[PDB]
């Protein structure tokens, strides 16, 4: 289980104790930027990074500390997951998608509605095997007990 490098996550960073910035950035960019600002560990096949003062949006529409982050090559297939949601505005239908490594069509998952800054229930609308990949895939470790974060608005472990 990892996510693709173009996965979007909501990140907050703090400097000098008192200043903070928040933005939506792709996970490969987060890794590449943060890999230079802070520095890399190495294990059997992980390059593992330990930032401080960075946070990520998780279950509960709250930011918790991002404790570590890593990237690695995997032999596993990338899978594109499309998740539909809708709201009563007269129905506005929305969908989001994330590609993961390794859940059933029809299952419900939590979804972040960015425009209304609230969490909604989504439906697994499709699942697609995109095949193997040579690119790095990425992993994030979160301090809250949900062990989950929002990945292109979809809650993933």
Numbering used by the authors: -1, 1 to 15, 15A, 15B, 15C, 16 to 85, 95 to 107, 128 to 182
Kindly provide excerpts from the paper associated with this entry:
Here, we report the novel and atypically split PolB16 OarG intein and its biochemical and structural characterization. The PolB16 intein carries an atypical split position close to the N-terminal end of the encoded split intein domain to give IntN and IntC fragments of 15 and 168 aa, respectively. Most notably, both residues at the 1 and +1 positions are serine. Furthermore, the intein overall exhibits the typical conserved motifs of a class 1 intein29 that represent conserved residues across inteins, of which some are involved in catalyzing the steps of the protein splicing pathway. This analysis suggested the PolB16 intein splices through linear and branched oxoester intermediates.
The IntC fragment contains two cysteines within motifs N3 and C2,30 (previously also referred to as motifs B and F)31 however, at non-essential and only moderately conserved positions that usually harbor hydrophobic residues. By replacement of two non-conserved cysteines, it could be mutated into a completely cysteine-less variant and further engineered for efficient splicing properties. To this end, we genetically fused the IntN and IntC precursors, each with 10 extein residues, with a 3 amino acid linker (GSH). Ser1 and Asn183 at the splice junctions were mutated to alanine to block all splicing activity. We obtained protein crystals in this format for both the wild-type sequence and the cysteine-less double mutant (C111A, C165A) and could solve these at resolutions of 1.85 and 2.6 Å, respectively. Both structures were virtually identical (0.185 Å RMSD, root mean square deviation), consistent with the negligible functional impact of mutating the non-conserved cysteine residues. The last well-resolved amino acids, Asp108 and His109, show a conformation of the polypeptide chain that departs from the canonical intein structure. As a consequence, His109 is placed in an unusual position, remote from the scissile bond, which is incompatible with its usual catalytic role. Our PolB16 intein structures showed the motif NX histidine in possible hydrogen-bond forming distance to the Ser1, when the side chain hydroxyl of the latter is modeled back in (3.0 Å).
